[PDB]
């Protein structure tokens, strides 16, 4: 339908207007912090971001054309990847730090407050660092995030995957369009395109590793998790 008829500029325009807001945490820098404290803050934050992500996914050219069961599957597969790439995006201005929220800046040290989190932080830090050394643009970020949404679950009657492939090809064209405007040569466009898509492989890795640790934690019940987050998480196990 509508997604394929869109040009590159109004594809970018659609993705930028569809952007979710940056939410605030309930962090009080006067309390003590701990394992259940951080995990409690991040759980509540991510749970509110999920609601925005759902209404964001609806405005991604193409997602709506899909059946509801396919939309459920894609979000269940990519929800942590989308949260993570958003995290490393807004953490670009803060080297060595992770901006979970405008009032929540954690470094590598505070990652040790939770077991197995400090390793994932370093990967998130390295990913954020990569975007920094590469000068990631907002127009490029919204393209990558949309790619993750349509790509995560595609391989996992209806060759709706064929439609998904068509939209992905459109986003690819959009990315190339952006790099052409930035004055990059043809060789530089393909290389940058490849560099960006290879990072998607890392975001997949970080997500899968974090999903396994997000399951260690549920079993503990040290800190409860919202009904939605549990259902998103249970889709992986």
């Amino acid at each position: 339908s509508l997604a394929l008829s869109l040009t590159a500029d109004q594809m970018v325009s659609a993705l930028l207007d569809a952007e979710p807001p940056i939410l605030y945490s309930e962090y009080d820098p006067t309390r003590p912090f701990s394992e259940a404290s951080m995990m409690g803050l991040l759980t509540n934050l991510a749970d509110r971001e999920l609601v925005h992500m759902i209404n964001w996914a609806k405005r991604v050219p193409g997602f709506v054309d899909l059946t509801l069961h396919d939309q459920v599957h894609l979000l269940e597969c990519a929800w942590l990847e989308i949260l993570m790439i958003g995290l490393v995006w807004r953490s670009m201005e803060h080297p060595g730090k992770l901006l979970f929220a405008p009032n929540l800046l954690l470094d590598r040290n505070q990652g040790k407050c939770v077991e197995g989190m400090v390793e994932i932080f370093d990967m998130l830090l390295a990913t954020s660092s990569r975007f920094r050394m590469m000068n990631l643009q907002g127009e490029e970020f919204v393209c990558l995030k949309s790619i993750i949404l349509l790509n995560s679950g595609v391989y996992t009657s209806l060759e709706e995957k064929d439609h998904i492939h068509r939209v992905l090809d459109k986003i690819t064209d959009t990315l190339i369009h952006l790099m052409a405007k930035a004055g990059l040569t043809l060789q530089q466009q393909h290389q940058r395109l490849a560099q960006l898509l290879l990072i998607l492989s890392h975001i997949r890795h970080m997500s899968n590793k974090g999903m396994e640790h997000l399951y260690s934690m549920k079993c503990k019940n040290v800190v409860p998790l919202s009904d939605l987050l549990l259902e998103m998480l249970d889709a992986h196990r």
């Binding site: 609601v51 759902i54 209404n55 996914a57 609806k58 509801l68 939309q71 459920v72 979000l75 269940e76 009904d227 939605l228 259902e231 998103m232």
Partner: peptide, 10 residues
């Protein structure tokens, strides 16, 4: 399912 209903609103 929660994700089901939230996608289905409006």
């Amino acid at each position: 399912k929660i994700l089901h209903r939230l996608l289905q609103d409006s």
